[PDB]
């Protein structure tokens, strides 16, 4: 047990002003604190709240070595890819979850927060990559992607693409293409002191 009563900084993550781009997803470590998970589910202001490896229904009785809160922005259609054993541009080239994933995945629409008249081009995603991503791996490289046989020498053109491309977060867009904020809670359980716990 922790032996100290300090609420965990979940507000910092869910209510953060600006979210990171999925290619450079943000990760916050959580330790030496206590927090009520069931408050989140009870709020019921989220559109997707799926947990793998643990019941969501008021499961605060459990204590974990560490917790990880990963946040980013994607499209609605792409939310289905933020789960174990899924394929797609996001799952392959941006954010991968392991098949033995024990955690929770939370997602909610943010059209009012992350749209701007004429488009918001601040949120990018990786479009070209030579190989798939390993689980919980992050790639921020901006090197020109050489598709042809000829070298690119760091110049944009045909067969020489910049790897990252921008989301067309238009305000008049359909739900499938509207921005969605995602937070992935991972529960690192190990043979180490339990620094995170439930209430009481």
């Amino acid at each position, epitope marked *: 047990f922790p032996n100290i009563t300090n609420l965990c900084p979940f507000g910092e993550v869910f209510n953060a002003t600006r979210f990171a781009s999925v290619y450079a997803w943000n990760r916050k470590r959580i330790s030496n604190c206590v927090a009520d998970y069931s408050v989140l589910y009870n709020s019921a202001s989220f559109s997707t709240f799926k947990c793998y490896g643990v019941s969501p229904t008021k499961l605060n009785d459990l204590c974990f070595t560490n917790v990880y809160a990963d946040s980013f922005v994607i499209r609605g*259609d792409e939310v289905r890819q933020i789960a174990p054993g899924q*394929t*797609g*541009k996001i799952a*392959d*080239y941006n954010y991968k979850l392991p098949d033995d994933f024990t955690g929770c995945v939370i997602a909610w629409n943010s059209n009012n927060l992350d749209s701007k008249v004429g488009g918001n081009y601040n949120y990018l995603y990786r*479009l*070209f*990559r*030579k190989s798939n991503l390993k689980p919980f791996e992050r790639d921020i490289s901006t090197e020109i992607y050489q*598709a*042809g046989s000829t070298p690119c020498n760091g110049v*944009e*053109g*045909f*067969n*020489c*693409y910049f790897p990252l*491309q921008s989301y067309g977060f238009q305000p008049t867009n*359909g739900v*499938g*293409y509207q921005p969605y904020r995602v937070v992935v809670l991972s529960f690192e359980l190990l043979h180490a002191p339990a620094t995170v716990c439930g209430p009481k």
Partner: antibody
């Protein structure tokens, strides 16, 4: 309502020249690449040429390299395909389409197409 | 200079069936494949792009998948309007190349 309209199709003798035009409405050519795709009667689709409107870079297919030339105009917001030294093998329905970036994306909008016949 | 091999060349199936069409690329193309539909005397209509991304205004029955260098287009349930020709296209390495085509005919 994005729209792409072809023009300039017709009948030309072997070895002649013909200039196809593709006028765009509802969007700006900037940041986009305009492509020309031809389809022979009762046959598959074959890519011909493409151009990045902003930078002016071009790319052609091996079969028509040298003979055809692709261009664009930003103020007119239209794309052109000049076809010189035409051959009977080139007879087909020519479509103009657009894609985002130099590559990686599909063709969102196609024109209705224009028929080009090459015969003596 | 990549070659896209499309199968089947022709397919006959009944309304309400689940259909699958495959396109294998000569080389790795990441996820730059797209799927188009063409009806007689009409321009191709874009169905899927970047392998597994639905296009606005397109029935949800159409889906796209990528396994390595193999790409798949799936129809959950067929509707009378889905009887047409289907092409796959790659935009990874120029010159861009389409597939041979797959004609879908109503069984009778």
């Amino acid at each position: 309502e994005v729209q792409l309209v072809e023009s300039g199709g017709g009948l030309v003798q072997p070895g002649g020249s013909l200039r196809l035009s593709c006028a765009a409405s509802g969007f700006d050519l900037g940041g986009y690449s305009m492509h020309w795709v031809r389809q022979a009667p009762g046959k598959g689709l074959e890519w011909v040429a493409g151009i990045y409107a902003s930078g002016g870079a071009t790319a052609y297919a091996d079969s028509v390299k040298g003979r055809f030339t692709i261009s664009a105009d930003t103020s007119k917001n239209t794309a052109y395909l000049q076809m010189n030294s035409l051959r009977a093998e080139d007879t087909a329905v020519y479509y103009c389409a657009r894609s985002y970036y130099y590559g990686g994306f599909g063709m969102d909008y196609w024109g209705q197409g224009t028929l080009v016949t090459v015969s003596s | 200079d990549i070659q896209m091999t499309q199968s089947p060349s022709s397919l006959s199936a009944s309304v309400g069936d689940r259909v699958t069409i495959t396109c294998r690329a000569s080389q790795s193309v990441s996820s730059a494949v797209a799927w188009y539909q063409q009806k007689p005397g009409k321009a191709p209509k874009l169905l899927i792009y970047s392998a597994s991304d639905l296009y606005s205004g397109v029935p949800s029955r159409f889906s796209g998948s990528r396994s390595g260098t193999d790409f798949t287009l799936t129809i959950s349930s067929l509707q009378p309007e889905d009887f047409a020709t289907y092409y796959c296209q790659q935009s990874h390495t120029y010159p861009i190349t389409f597939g041979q085509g797959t004609k879908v005919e109503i069984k009778r």
